[PDB]
């Protein structure tokens, strides 16, 4: 119902994000902690997880669109900048035209 939506947002806007950011990265892991300096803001969480956090509270779409969007963004992102240390051959670097 229209007011219970507020709580279904708030648990992802705050709780799931801050407890992840501090807990997983700093103490817990051998997962993100091998790369400890790389994350300091939500813009880094977006770039690293390929997911549209903190936004779009009213939008509806297919799961296939989100799955597509992640790879669709990644195959853009690796051609957008050369971190991590991969490279693209001149044929592959021509064919992002497609």
């Amino acid at each position: 119902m229209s007011n219970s939506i507020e709580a279904k947002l708030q648990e992802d806007l705050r709780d799931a994000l801050v407890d992840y950011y501090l807990g997983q990265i700093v103490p817990n892991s051998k997962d993100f902690t091998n790369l400890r300096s790389t994350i300091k803001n939500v813009d880094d969480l977006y770039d690293h997880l390929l997911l549209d956090t903190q936004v779009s509270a009213k939008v509806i779409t297919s799961r296939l669109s989100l799955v597509t969007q992640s790879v669709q963004q990644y195959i853009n992102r690796i051609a957008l900048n050369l971190e991590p240390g991969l490279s693209i051959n001149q044929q592959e670097a021509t064919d992002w035209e497609e």
């Binding site: 119902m1 229209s2 007011n3 219970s4």
Partner: protein, 116 residues
């Protein structure tokens, strides 16, 4: 109202208190004059010295006026309105965690429609 109050006052020490005033029918007329529930009004047995209680000849009726109007603002029970009192005094936490969820569920049972 007079016949109800006169009956409530009959001989508490020498007869009626140990016979629970025949709670199953004396507390019924207190509901019937309101056209209301003879059930949840028995929660009054949580106070006043193991009496029904009813012989406090105004304050229980005076409170039940406000319980009847609160019971039309919202579909919550008088049993849960008691917990909303008990939670005041830095009380045990699981009762608050449960009462918040119980009030949320009582709103979903009405929703953006009206329902009950």
């Amino acid at each position: 109202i007079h016949e109800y109050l006169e009956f409530a006052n009959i001989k508490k020490t020498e007869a009626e208190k140990t016979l629970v005033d025949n709670s199953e029918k004396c507390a019924e007329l207190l509901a019937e004059i309101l056209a209301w529930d003879a059930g949840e009004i028995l929660k009054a047995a949580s106070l006043l010295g193991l009496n029904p209680p009813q012989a406090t000849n105004v304050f229980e009726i005076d409170w039940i006026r406000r319980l009847q109007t609160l019971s039309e603002k919202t579909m919550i029970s008088t049993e849960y309105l008691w917990q909303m009192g008990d939670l005041t005094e830095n009380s045990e936490f699981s009762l608050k965690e449960g009462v918040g969820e119980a009030v949320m569920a009582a709103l979903k049972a009405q929703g953006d429609s009206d329902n009950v």
